[PDB]
Subunit: 474 residues, 4 copies
């Protein structure tokens, strides 16, 4: 109840600075003034390079069907098994102050505090992505963000990049459909997007795809309304998630996976490891795993939502990486991003702490809250008591072939986009076309528009024709 400094000393006057006489100059000995101002000056930290605008909530995951036959992952071992989790939803391009209701993919990050480590499933509200190789991420993101000279958004850059990257057609179609702007985070799906690996106790391998289906149903915002809400309420989605949980209308998602046995995978490498493609659900139907429920709002947004650190590379025994090139790059990127954005010791912050015990030889670093007791910080050592490797946790070995080199991917950039285009109801197709026209129509370089239109035409003649037609009407 008494105001204090950061060292617990009481503050006598929090309204007036120490001054040399009523109208005299302010004194340097007003240490609290200095401290208060200095800490205020250091409140801002760098925002996430992408997915800066987000909302979070605590929850739980409950297994409905054991997956022990496919993975030794502890949190999925028994029916009814509960695991605490934390989720963060977000947009992609917008900065800290941007509006929620913009057209953009939505982040669907999940951190499961399992008994064998924190497992992160860092997905999106889309099963695919715009690119397939991590080396192109900075290029994609740069084209999606601000003009380095004017600081204004550049549709010219957005489309110039996509017109030279046909592999983005599938995701561009999803981005421009109605689902490009969800009604709320509670009304969108979640996907791991990448094909991941599951390994059971016997060492049997399976390639899987995660699908988090919203139990609230898919609902979107028409483009016009979304723009209106972007002005009337830029935190529309954040507020919605918070109010829903405070009103005890806990949103939930049913998680099911597509399971592809190793043997099967050997025939579909070009599809399975290309994140710009989906795996037919007729060939490999969804198998229910459990339910995710968000039931508790953060205590403090900055401490939990802003400081939380997710990484696709945060695996737990039983779940491993696949040769998906985009995923491969992400395995490095996130841990690296965390160290710059939060710090070498970000894992020590409450929201990032593991439920399972952490026993390392890792030491020091900035703001190290806990370095331990031990005099032994190296391994191998002659002290039986200290942490040792667990051979049991080695990843499953797989065969490597050919030469080390720079290989290109498949060129089947049109088939799946066309399939999606054909599945869209007439009313959504008109929106798809108008959304593209409104964006692509802002481009000045006629050569970029033509290249892009030829691309859409290759997906479906009507697709390209309709797009070209909508632009002419402006």
């Amino acid at each position: 109840q008494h105001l204090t400094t950061s060292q617990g000393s009481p503050v006598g006057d929090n309204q007036n600075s120490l001054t040399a006489g009523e109208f005299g100059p302010v004194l340097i000995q007003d240490v609290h003034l200095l401290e208060k101002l200095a800490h205020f000056n250091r409140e801002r930290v760098p925002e996430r390079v992408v997915h800066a605008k987000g909302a979070g909530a605590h929850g739980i995951f409950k297994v409905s069907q054991s997956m022990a036959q496919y993975t030794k992952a502890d949190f999925l071992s028994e029916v009814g098994k509960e695991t605490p989790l934390f989720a963060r939803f977000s947009t992609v391009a917008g900065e800290l102050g941007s509006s929620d209701t913009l057209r953009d993919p939505r982040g669907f990050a999940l951190k499961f505090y399992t008994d064998e480590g924190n497992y992160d499933l860092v997905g999106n509200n889309t099963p695919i992505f715009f690119i397939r190789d991590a080396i192109k991420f900075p290029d994609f993101i740069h084209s999606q963000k601000r003009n380095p000279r004017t600081h204004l958004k550049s549709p010219e850059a957005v489309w110039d990049f996509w017109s030279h990257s046909p592999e983005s057609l599938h995701q561009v179609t999803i981005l421009m459909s109605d689902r490009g702007i969800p009604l709320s985070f509670r009304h969108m799906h979640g996907f791991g997007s990448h094909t991941f690996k599951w390994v059971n106790a016997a060492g049997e391998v399976f390639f899987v795809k995660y699908h988090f289906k919203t139990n609230q149903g898919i609902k979107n915002l028409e483009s016009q309304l979304a723009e209106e809400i972007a002005g009337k309420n830029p935190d529309f989605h954040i507020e919605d998630l918070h109010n829903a949980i405070e009103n005890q209308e806990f949103p939930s998602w049913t998680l099911s996976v597509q399971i592809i046995p190793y043997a099967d995978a050997l025939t579909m490498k070009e599809t399975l490891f290309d994140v710009t493609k989906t795996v037919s659900q007729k060939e490999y139907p969804l198998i229910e795993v459990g339910t995710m429920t968000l039931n508790r709002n953060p205590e403090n947004y900055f401490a939990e939502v802003e400081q939380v650190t997710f990484s696709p590379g945060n695996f737990v025994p039983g779940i491993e990486a696949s040769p998906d090139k985009l995923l491969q790059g992400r395995l490095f990127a996130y841990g690296d991003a965390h160290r710059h954005r939060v710090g070498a010791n970000s894992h020590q912050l409450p929201i990032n702490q593991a439920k399972a015990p952490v026993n390392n030889y890792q030491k020091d670093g900035n703001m190290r809250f806990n370095n331990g007791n031990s005099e032994i910080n190296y391994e191998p050592n002659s002290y039986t008591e200290t942490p040792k490797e667990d051979p049991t946790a080695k990843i499953s070995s797989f065969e490597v072939e050919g030469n080390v080199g720079n290989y290109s991917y498949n060129q089947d950039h049109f088939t799946q986009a066309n399939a999606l285009y054909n599945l869209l109801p007439s009313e959504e197709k008109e929106n798809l076309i108008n959304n593209i026209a409104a964006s692509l129509g802002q481009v000045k370089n006629q050569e970029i528009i033509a290249r892009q239109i030829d691309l859409f035409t290759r997906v479906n003649p009507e697709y390209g024709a309709r797009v070209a037609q909508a632009i002419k009407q402006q």
Copy 2:
């Protein structure tokens, strides 16, 4: 024309990562992939704690009337004297991605590259401020920003704070008037707000107020339209400034000052050093100094607009600080903020470099681009050639009186706000009332609303009555 790494080595493939066989894992030896991703991961820096959303432009200042009789400031010594300058305009509360057209004071920061050092005039588009003591800045800003728990804006906090800080009434009235949302940065005035000190060659002292009057005229956005534009174009003001300069419609401002001699100032301390008050232009009319013109857009936004560092404490001989408590705190705050946000050596970045020679004993620090030749980094020393103090630049001494202590200011919070309220034309008064009602009306704590309404009533009975009525009608 050849893509290279940061060390100038050519890049062979910028589309595909090095992989162990066509469908094999990505290799750690792809150093460029690592570098490209790692540098991308470090692109974000902390945004300014306040005034994060801004736009900048290069320009010049030209003296129309020498001020040598009042100040020995070199850049104001001769008629026609030109000085290069850089300006940054901004809002206050919004983060990097926020919209331009929001109700908020606007920053009017100017950096003059004079022959005797970089002189910064860090003003606002208002002659006054909400508080008078720097110790309250973090409190004011916290109330103006996001709820620490929900991350949503809180009118409850905004008004709770103002209802307990009657000294804010004057500026709140300005904030809520039409000028609260300018049509563009080119259509608002600029002010130093604080009373500053001018000293001539003879050592004569004058207290002054800076007034930058827009030569394009004052123009504002009605609240409704502003909200609409906030959605349709969040970078409306940034784009406007850039287009105007690219179209050669160089915006300009006429600078004039109010000059109060030492002898006069002796009787007006309570008004002169209170930033919530203005000085009558009838008693002390504006005296023209020169013209500021913005005629060149930035080469790169991040390098120039984001990294530029301004400080009210960046004085040049002839211009000094006054005992204004708010100003006094700012003398510390900015340099401190720069060191955290940009770095100890931010002055070495092109946009922050002084035109005038920099000769110090300051050394090292992170990313030190230039440490010099000298073996002598201490003073006093026996080397005549090294930089020495210039007694000529000592500030003018002034008398100090009474006891060191925590003094409060005057309680005259209503008179000037009432004067302003009485000068507003009927149509703007209606807007003033509706703007307040829309905001204060969102508060839940009836005790806060009542306290605030009693405050407005004390400014003018009609003022408070109209506000109360407006709220009741919702």
Copy 3:
């Protein structure tokens, strides 16, 4: 007992990196390799700008005589009152890897975890200092450290600076005496050096000087042996402190103060506020306060000794600052240094946490371990429950006189140094002279040596004569 990653996931192989085939390239998907290497890469933090090489220990302070008649400081209110504390001893110029047994003042930093906040007494093993104005600290330290060009120590710089700063004579004499190199941290005294202020419950003011006298007695190392030990064992003092405590030979110090009533200061401002001078002990004898005992070694050196943050400005009710210009500058310097070296939230690290409750409106910042529950982060506010100022803690007001300006101190640089020179026994005087000769004798600029010798001659004719002669014999 199982080795894990920072997220608690088990490590399968801590001896071999993931590789594409026995002799194939290392894979980027070995996330643990990446993490382990990356955290290792961030273990180093910037060392303290001064006093980088140190040792620490936990202990207690026990009051033997209540000081309630002179100060309302809670930790000194009752006889027998115990207060937990942490101490850090160090040299001044040496970097992290430098040897302990070098000639240099020794730091004597103490952090008392009192019930009204952490009180820091940041003193040295000397009652005085080399300079009297904080504006000269960077200059003094630069001259004391490495040549910016060669990175070698420079006696030319050391003496050039002292030869132009006669106020350093007193401390130079102490530095060059036998006490310039203590046998161990347990065999040196501690002093607050500066005159501080004590205020009792009635508001009565007293100026005080802190004296921590070693209960183990003063013992020093002859110059030759110290140099030998600097090679044979660079951590001689650190090891000594640790072994002594592990062997239960707890070192202790008896703290007593010199108490000067406010009114008495009227004739001593020139002495009392000039840190290059001491106050006569005959006029103002030592008054015992209590005993400090170090009885527990750190759990981890980096976490406690390296990360601890001390500040002379960390006062508690009853103890305040004096107008000593050097002290005044330190009031700013330390908190500022902490924010750069450790971080904005360094107060949250265990070693820096207050025992007394910390209730602020300060929020966020890098690595914020605790932001709290409250939605209210601004004051004044309408929530009675939130932290409020305690008028009772306001500092005692004192009168200010004259003009704001740049004033110079006293010119009596010789009297006290001469008194000390006359008190030294013949054998220590020979050492004093030889120590100076060995150092000053390395200077090349004959003008610097002459200026310095004239200075010593002014302290005492014999002093200067002996120094000049000792140098001649080289």
Copy 4:
């Protein structure tokens, strides 16, 4: 000649702080005091995690024999071709203030500013290393540095680690020989240690080993003298290099390589890619390449020596990495270390700038000195003028075999160490034994000593016997 602030404004008084009256408190408006102190507070940056204590110098490399037949490396294309370079020599374990003359490997880092990028050869004064897998580096270094609890060096940890890592025997033997402490940096050799790859214009591949032989000859310090010098002059090696260059006694090294054709290498993978082993000089004799000469001291130590960034991964066309596991980890480690220690934009500091043009899409980041002109920061793009990949620079592809997994290396840890032991003259062998005895003899755990002695015995019965015998005599 006039002292100024960082913004070029003149300083009036650099000896006295602004004060409210002669004996009044210091004023916060003394912005220069604040700035001077604040910048001084930020002078320290984190030291290198290893090799913190070093010295540097500028020089040149002149080709004596063209290597065009083996590598297309531009700087080695013609006889007489000169390339500017910068070198940094250092120890390994010691911190910034440690002494030069300690037993430890010496760093031999070289940065060649070639016309096709900065090529870094980051070697040591030994052809081998203690470990063969990067995953063990943090463990090795931790054992070599300070006890986490006491902060004292721990021979118990040093030997515990080596006793469990027999692959270190070869390098330990070199470390303990006379060459463990060079007389000066000018009297030691330099090696790349790892086997690197050379590829010529026709695409032919060769595996190479770099050997920089000192033209001043090998000279060492006996252990006793080294310890003496460690106390008398901790910067003995730094001073030596500087004086030599200032006296125009430019030290030089003759570089020659061992060249192993791809076909030959196919049979020696276990030796070639194991850094604890050397390639026979009879089978593959040294082939002279050119001469390295150091002829210019740094302008400023901090700016050049402290801030320079080297990386084994900084290759230039014609030189590539080999599957050496230790090297592989280093390819990641250095760039990562630079980003933490110096910053994302360290490549922009003068000492790190490339001579060859740098054309990227990399942008922003902290302290970005140059972001350029371009509006185009993404690739692919439709602007012919912007930087594009150079397929010509792709690395040579090589075959990968088997399974992805955690493979262990060769177990031949004794043969080469024995060969070296047999080549040492009697007098050096006695030193080798005594050096080991003095160190290993300090270990308490008899089980560690026994394990280690059995290891030496396995190298050579006499080796182990002599070591065991030397210890017994203590």
